[PDB]
Scaffold this active site. Structure first.
Site, PDB file in Angstrom:
ATOM      1  N   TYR A 511       0.924  -1.113   0.000  1.00  0.00           N
ATOM      2  CA  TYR A 511       0.000   0.000   0.000  1.00  0.00           C
ATOM      3  C   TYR A 511       0.973   1.173   0.000  1.00  0.00           C
ATOM      4  O   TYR A 511       1.262   1.740  -1.050  1.00  0.00           O
ATOM      5  CB  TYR A 511      -0.880   0.051   1.237  1.00  0.00           C
ATOM      6  CG  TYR A 511      -1.971   1.066   1.025  1.00  0.00           C
ATOM      7  CD1 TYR A 511      -3.015   0.812   0.133  1.00  0.00           C
ATOM      8  CD2 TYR A 511      -1.914   2.323   1.627  1.00  0.00           C
ATOM      9  CE1 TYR A 511      -3.975   1.787  -0.165  1.00  0.00           C
ATOM     10  CE2 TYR A 511      -2.873   3.307   1.337  1.00  0.00           C
ATOM     11  CZ  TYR A 511      -3.901   3.027   0.438  1.00  0.00           C
ATOM     12  OH  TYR A 511      -4.856   3.973   0.137  1.00  0.00           O
ATOM     13  N   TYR A 595      -3.690   2.287  -3.956  1.00  0.00           N
ATOM     14  CA  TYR A 595      -2.393   2.967  -3.936  1.00  0.00           C
ATOM     15  C   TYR A 595      -1.294   1.919  -4.059  1.00  0.00           C
ATOM     16  O   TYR A 595      -0.267   2.150  -4.696  1.00  0.00           O
ATOM     17  CB  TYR A 595      -2.198   3.748  -2.621  1.00  0.00           C
ATOM     18  CG  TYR A 595      -1.014   4.701  -2.647  1.00  0.00           C
ATOM     19  CD1 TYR A 595      -1.197   6.068  -2.866  1.00  0.00           C
ATOM     20  CD2 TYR A 595       0.292   4.229  -2.531  1.00  0.00           C
ATOM     21  CE1 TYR A 595      -0.109   6.938  -2.979  1.00  0.00           C
ATOM     22  CE2 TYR A 595       1.388   5.087  -2.642  1.00  0.00           C
ATOM     23  CZ  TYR A 595       1.176   6.439  -2.871  1.00  0.00           C
ATOM     24  OH  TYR A 595       2.246   7.285  -3.044  1.00  0.00           O
TER      25      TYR A 595
END
Ligand SMILES: O=C(NC[C@@H]1CN[C@H](C(=O)N2CCSC2)C1)c1cscn1
Lengths: 730, 730
Positions: A511, A595
Site C-alpha cells: 500500500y 495505492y
C-alpha cells in the site's frame, strides 16, 4: 495436520468474533444477541430484552440496521439498503414506538432517504431526501422541510458530494445537531463547475443497452465544488411555513481562493467549532463561533481564530485533527505535530495567543493516535508509545490537574496476546470496553473505569481457538530493519513450521500511501494466511518513508513527490529480507491494491531486477487522473507554476519498457468510481505500445473494492493461480 | 532450414505482390509504380508517365490516395485521412489540373469532406460535408449546395448512417451520378428515433477526463433509421440559388412498416433501378423508374415492379444481388436462387411477368459468385462451378445470342497454381486482367478479350518465391468430408514435413457466420502459417451448415436459429479430423474472431469435451446486443410474437457452467463500435458468477479489428503464448 485452505478464506470457514456494544448511558449498553437487542448493565451481567428476535422480521429479512433514539423511546429500523460509493447509501425507514409497542405509521419517512439521524437529546429527527434536509420534532409529527435548493449532482444539502464524502469527511453525512437540539447545522455544496466522469454499467444481461453513470468528480487541478455553512433554529418550525437558516462565512484568510470545510464540532449550544482548509492544505484555520441572542446571528471573531500550519507538507494525517472541548468550553485539546514533528496532544484557549496557542501535554518519539474521552479531570487517549512499537495500540490516560499522573491501562493486561487495543468508554467514562486485536485472537473485556477492575470477559475467541487447533496456522513476526540510521518496521507472515535455514518464496504486500501502516500487531485471517499456511510463501509488508505514525519527518518525506521514496524503500526492504537468508531470491513477487497497485506497478517498472512478477489491482497510473482533495494534498497542483513536473515524472506508463523483465497481472473493476479504470486502460495501452506482454482481467460492473461475493472469490482464485504459475508451484 | 517466424508474420517479412490497375478506357489503364501514376497500353507494354513521383509530395507524405476524373483532365488528391467505422472516413482534398499543370486553388473543397466522387463523364464533382451534399460542375467553379437538412448523428444526406454503412451498402457513400451526369440521386437517413450506444475513449495519457462517443445504433428489434430517395437536376444549378430535388417514394408493398433501401442502379439517364427490402428480409422489391420530361417527375409503375422472395430464409447472400441492364435497358440479368436454391444468373424484362419474371441462363449444383461485365453479346461472370470446388473461383463467359456458347477462361491457365481468380475487364471488355490468388503464389496477367491470348505477365511473385525458398513453408489441403450424405469442405494448414503417421496438435479456425466461407483455394501468409511452420500445429477450418456458395439448402439451414447447427457441425468436423489419425486428441483447440468468437465460445461452452482450450476475440454473446439489419435478417425480431425464444436460447452466458472444463481466453477492444464490448463484459460477468476461472485481455481504444500496429502485434503474441501454454509447447 490440515493447512489453511484458500477456501477457508473465501468461504470464511473460521469466524473471528467480537463484542460490538452501544453505550446508552454512563452505565448501560446495547448488544445484538441472536437478533435481539439486549440492554446490559456494566458492573453486573444484569441483562434484559430491549428489542425482540421479533420486530426485526416484520420488515422481513431486509432489516439492514437499527438506531435507538437517545431517550430510548423509539427505534429507527433501516431496510432496503442500497450502496452508493464508499459510505453513501439509501434506505427505507420505520420508527418503532417502544412504549406504544408498535410501528408509527402516520407521518412516515420517504422511501429513499439518503441520510437520517436522531438529535443528541430526545427524539428529534433530521434526514436528507432528494438532496433536501427535513426535520421532525417528534416521530408521530409531520415532516418540516428545511431546504429546497436540493438537486441531484448539483446541489447537496446536508450530505457530501462525491469528493467530500470520500476525501474530507469520512462519510455521507453533512448534518450536526447542537447539544439540547435547538440548532441544526449543515453544509451545502455546489458541484456546478465540477467536471464529470462517465463510466458504463452493464447490469443484468437482459439490459439491451448499457447505462452510463456520470459523477461530478474533480481530478487533480480541476474546478472543485463550493461550500456554505448554515445553522437553522429547530424550535420555531411549528410557528412558520419556512424558517430562515443563518449562514456562517468561512474566515477571510481562506476565502481568497479555493478552499474546503474540514470539520464541524459543537462546543456547547451557543458555541460551534468549524475548521477550514485552503485548496493547498499548507494552511488551516479553526474558527470558534458564538450565538448572538440579540441580533440572532453567529459570530466568528478573528480573536478566536486559531491557525494550523505545515512547512514540511500538509495538515494532519488526512485532515486537521478534531478538537475536544471542556464542559464550560473555555479550552480544548487537539492532536497537532509538535516542534519535532510528532503528533501529540496540546491545550488551547478559545482565544488564540500570539505564537503560544498551544501547550503540549505529551512528548516523545511516538504519537497520540486519537483522543477517546475528556472527563472533567481526565483525558483518555490511544497511542503507540508502549515498547516503542509504532505498530502497536494502547489506551492511556492523563489527569488534567496533574500532567504527571499519566498511566497506561492496557499495557499489562495480556502483553503476549494483546498489543493492539481499540477502546470504547461509556457516556461519562465510568466503564470502558477494551478490544484486543493484539497479536493473538481478539479479546474483548469491559472494565470499571475507577480502578480498572476487569468486571468480566465479553468475548475471548475460545470457539475460534478450538477450531484453529486442528490447523497449521502461520505465525507473524513484527520487527524492524534500520536504513540510513532510522528504524523502519516490517511484518512477515511466516508459513507454519518455518525453518530459518530453508529458502522460501517471498511476496511483498503493499500500500504505502501517505500516512499508511501495513506493519502492525493486529490479528488477521486473510489471503496471506492461506498463502503461507498452504503455499509456504512468506508474505511481508514494509512501512517505509511517507508512512504511519512516526513523526512528520518520515511521513512528509514524500511531500510533492509521490511515486518516489515510498517505492524505492519498498525495494530496499526486499533487499534486506533477502540478506536475511531464508528467501529464495529466484522467487520474489509483489502485489498491491489501490495505492498499493500503484507502487507495485512502479516497482515492477523500475527494472531493479529484484522482482519476478507482480499484481496491481485498481492501481493509479498517474496523479492527474486521481481526485483533487487527495492528490493535491501531497502533490500540489499539476501546473507549471507548481508541481507539474513531479506529476509527469511519476507515471506508470512512463516505465512501460522495464516491464519486459517481469510477469505482470493488471486487474480492474469496470464500475470503479474511485480509481477510474481509465487508469489501468492507460497502462495496458502503454505496455501494448511498448510491445510488453502482460496479463489483464476486468471485472464487469465491479467497484473499486471488487467486493461482490462472486467477484471477490473469483479475483483471489485468479491471483492465486497467477502466483502459482509464477512461483512454479500449482 | 528456417521456419516461418511469428515475427515473419508480425513484421511482414515476406511481401506478397499484386497488380492493382485502374482501367481508364477500353484500351488503357493506370498503375502506381514507385509513386508515379503510369498510363499503360493494354496490347503493347507501351507506357507513359501520368503523374510524377512529384506532385504527390507537395501534400507532403499525407497523400492518402488519388482519383482521376474520367476525362483524365484532373486528379483528386486525398490527404489527412481519418478513419471512422469500417468504411467511413474524412479527408482533405486538392484538385490538380493536369492540363494547366498545377493545383487548382480557387473554389477549394472543405477541409473535412466525408465523401467525394467524380461523375461518370466529365469533371463534375459531388461531395458530402457536414452531412450536406454539394456539387461543382467544374473544378475551378464555385460549390453549389444541394441540401441543408444535414445534421450530425441525425440527418444524413448522401452518406449512410452507421447501420446502413455497415449492413446494407458496403460503404459510406449514398450518392449516384446518372450516366451523362444530368441527375444526381441520393439517399437521406433520419436517425431520430434510433437509440444510442455510448462507449468511452481514453485517448493519449494527457487527456485528464476520458471522452464519450455516442452512436445512433439500432440493436435487434430497436427503432431503425428511416429513408428517402431524391434525384436533383444538375444542369440547372447555375440558374437558381436553390434547386428542388424530386423524391421517389418506395413501392407500396414496402411502406406499411419498417423497411430499407437495398441497392441503387442507373439504367440509362432517364431510367433508374431501386431495390427495397422489408424489415423482415423475407420480401424484396426492385422498382424501375422512368423520368417524365413533361411533368418533370420520376414514375415507378407497379408494372415494372419485380418481386424477390424467400420461403427458406432471406434475400440474397447479404442483400438482393445487383441488376445488370442491357444498353437499351430493355432487359437485365440478376443473380437469384433458382428452383433448387442455387444462386444463378437469369433474365428479366423491364416489365414484370406473372410468375415467369425470370429465365435462367445458368443451372447446376454450384453458384454464380458475381457478374463482371455485360457486353452487347457476352456476359462475363465468376463461379465456383469448375471441378465442383465451392471454394474455388473461375471466370466464365456466355454468349447472349447462344446460351450454349459458355466457356471458362481461366480453368486451363495454371490448374496447379491457380484455382481462385479475381477479374477486371476494361471499359468495354476488350482486355481483361486476371488475378490468381489460387493455391500457389498470386499470379497477375492481362489478356486480349478476343482470343484470350495472354498479352503478358503483369506480376508473378518471383521475388517472394526466391525468398520462400530458404524457408520451411507449410502446405494447405483443401478437401471435403461427408456428413449426413452431403459434401462439406474443409481446409488444413499442414506443418512442413507433415508426416501422416505422427500426431499433431489441432487448432480449429472459425467464423461460420451465415454465407461465409473459410475453406477456399486462396494463397495466404497469416498467423496460421507461423503456427504450422514453427509450432507444428495443424490449423483447420470447416465450412458447415449455414455457409458459403452451395445452395440455400445449406445456407438457409441456420435460419431463425443462429448458434445452432453451425456450432454443432464445427464440433462434428473436429471429430472427423481426429478419426483421420494424425491428430493428438489431447491437444485440440479453437479460436475465432467476431462471429467466429461467438462460435468458439458456444463450442467451448457446449461441454462436448472435444476441445482443451480456445480464444474468442470480440465475440457476440447474445443477439439482442447486435445491430438490427444483420441480426434480424437471420433471426427475425426478438419478440414473443416472433423469435424471442431462439434469441434467449443462443446465449453464450447461458453456457457459463460448461466452461469449467476449458481454458478460455476472452479478448476485446475498448472502442469496438461494432460488437460493443458490452458483449464480452456480459460473458466475463457470467463466468464470474458461475465461478469459472478464465483469462481476459482488453485493448484500450482499439477497434473491432484491434488493428492498430502495436495492438495487432501485441494481440497475436499474446494468443501465441496462450496456445503455447495450453499445448504444453513454449
Ligand atoms: O459485409 C457485409 N455483411 C457482413 C456483415 C457486416 N457486419 C457484420 C459484422 O460485422 N458482424 C460482427 C459480429 S457478427 C456480424 C457482418 C455486407 C456488405 S453489403 C451488405 N452486407
Amino acid at each position: 495436520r490440515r493447512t489453511y485452505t484458500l477456501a477457508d478464506y473465501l468461504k470464511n470457514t473460521f469466524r473471528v468474533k467480537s463484542y460490538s456494544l452501544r453505550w446508552v448511558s454512563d452505565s448501560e449498553y446495547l448488544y445484538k444477541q441472536e437478533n435481539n437487542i439486549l440492554l446490559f448493565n456494566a458492573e453486573h451481567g444484569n441483562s434484559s430484552i430491549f428489542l425482540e428476535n421479533s420486530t426485526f422480521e416484520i420488515f422481513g429479512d431486509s432489516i439492514s440496521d437499527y438506531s435507538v433514539s437517545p431517550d430510548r423511546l423509539f427505534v429507527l429500523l433501516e431496510y432496503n439498503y442500497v450502496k452508493q460509493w464508499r459510505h453513501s447509501y439509501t434506505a427505507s425507514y420505520s420508527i418503532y414506538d417502544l412504549n406504544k409497542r408498535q410501528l408509527i405509521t402516520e407521518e412516515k419517512i420517504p422511501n429513499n432517504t439518503q441520510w437520517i439521524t436522531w438529535s443528541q437529546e430526545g427524539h428529534k429527527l433530521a434526514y436528507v431526501w432528494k438532496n433536501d434536509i427535513y426535520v421532525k420534532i417528534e416521530p408521530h409529527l409531520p415532516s418540516h422541510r428545511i431546504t429546497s435548493t436540493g438537486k441531484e449532482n448539483v446541489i447537496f444539502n446536508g450530505i457530501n458530494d462525491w469528493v467530500y464524502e470520500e476525501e474530507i469527511f469520512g462519510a455521507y453525512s453533512a448534518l450536526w445537531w447542537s447539544p439540547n437540539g435547538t440548532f441544526l447545522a449543515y453544509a451545502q455544496f455546489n458541484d456546478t463547475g465540477v467536471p464529470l466522469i462517465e463510466y458504463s454499467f452493464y447490469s443484468d444481461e437482459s439490459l439491451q443497452y448499457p447505462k452510463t453513470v456520470w459523477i461530478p468528480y474533480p481530478k487533480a487541478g480541476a474546478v472543485n465544488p463550493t461550500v456554505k455553512f448554515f445553522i437553522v433554529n429547530t424550535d420555531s418550525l411549528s410557528s412558520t411555513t419556512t424558517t430562515i437558516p443563518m449562514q456562517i462565512t468561512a474566515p477571510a484568510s481562506v476565502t481568497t481562493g479555493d478552499h474546503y470545510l474540514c470539520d464541524v464540532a459543537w462546543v456547547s449550544e451557543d458555541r460551534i467549532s468549524l475548521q477550514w482548509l485552503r485548496r493547498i492544505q499548507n494552511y488551516s484555520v479553526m474558527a470558534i463561533c458564538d450565538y448572538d441572542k440579540t441580533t440572532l446571528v453567529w459570530n466568528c471573531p478573528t480573536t478566536q481564530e486559531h491557525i494550523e500550519t505545515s512547512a514540511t507538507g500538509w495538515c494532519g494525517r488526512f485532515r486537521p485533527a478534531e478538537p475536544h472541548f471542556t464542559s464550560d468550553g473555555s479550552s480544548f485539546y487537539k492532536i497537532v505535530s509538535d516542534k519535532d514533528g510528532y503528533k501529540h496532544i496540546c491545550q488551547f484557549q478559545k482565544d488564540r495567543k500570539p505564537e503560544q496557542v498551544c501547550t503540549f501535554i505529551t512528548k516523545g518519539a511516538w504519537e497520540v493516535i486519537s483522543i477517546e474521552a475528556l472527563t472533567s479531570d481526565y483525558l483518555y487517549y490511544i497511542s503507540n508509545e508502549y515498547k516503542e512499537m509504532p505498530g502497536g495500540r494502547n489506551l492511556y490516560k492523563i489527569q488534567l490537574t496533574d500532567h504527571t499522573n499519566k498511566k497506561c491501562l492496557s499495557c499489562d493486561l495480556n502483553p503476549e496476546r494483546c498489543q493492539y487495543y481499540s477502546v470504547s468508554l461509556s457516556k461519562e467514562a465510568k466503564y470502558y470496553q477494551l478490544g484486543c486485536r493484539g497479536p493473538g485472537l481478539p479479546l474483548y473485556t469491559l472494565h470499571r473505569s475507577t480502578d480498572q477492575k476487569e468486571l468480566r470477559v465479553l468475548e475471548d475467541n475460545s470457539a475460534l481457538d478450538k477450531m484453529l487447533q486442528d490447523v497449521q496456522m502461520p505465525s507473524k513476526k513484527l520487527d524492524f530493519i534500520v536504513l540510513n540510521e532510522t528504524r523502519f518496521w516490517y511484518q512477515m507472515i511466516l508459513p507454519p513450521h518455518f525453518d530459518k535455514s530453508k529458502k522460501y518464496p517471498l511476496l511483498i504486500d503493499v500500500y504505502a500511501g501517505p500516512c499508511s501502516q501495513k506493519a502492525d500487531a493486529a490479528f488477521r485471517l486473510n489471503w496471506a494466511t492461506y498463502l503461507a499456511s498452504t503455499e509456504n510463501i512468506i508474505v511481508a509488508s514494509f512501512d517505509g518513508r511517507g508512512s504511519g505514525y512516526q513523526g512528520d519527518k518520515i511521513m512528509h518525506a514524500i511531500n510533492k513527490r509521490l511515486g518516489t521514496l515510498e517505492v524505492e524503500d519498498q525495494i530496499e526492504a526486499a533487499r534486506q529480507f533477502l540478506k536475511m537468508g531464508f528467501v529464495d531470491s529466484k522467487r520474489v513477487a509483489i502485489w498491491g491494491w489501490s495505492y498499493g497497485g500503484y507502487v507495485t506497478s512502479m516497482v515492477l517498472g523500475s527494472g531493479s531486477g529484484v522482482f519476478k512478477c507482480g499484481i496491481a489491482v485498481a492501481p493509479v497510473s498517474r496523479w492527474e487522473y486521481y481526485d483533487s482533495v487527495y492528490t493535491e494534498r501531497y502533490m500540489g497542483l499539476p501546473t507549471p507554476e507548481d508541481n507539474l513536473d513531479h506529476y509527469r515524472n511519476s507515471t506508470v506508463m512512463s516505465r512501460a519498457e522495464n516491464f519486459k523483465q517481469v510477469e505482470y497481472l493488471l486487474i480492474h473493476g469496470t464500475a470503479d468510481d474511485n480509481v477510474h479504470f481509465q487508469q489501468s486502460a492507460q497502462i495496458s495501452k502503454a505496455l501494448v505500445d511498448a510491445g510488453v506482454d502482460f496479463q489483464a482481467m476486468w471485472y464487469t460492473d465491479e467497484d473499486h473494492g471488487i467486493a461482490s461475493s462472486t467477484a471477490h472469490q473469483h479475483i483471489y482464485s485468479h491471483m492465486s493461480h497467477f502466483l502459482q504459475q509464477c512461483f512454479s508451484l500449482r
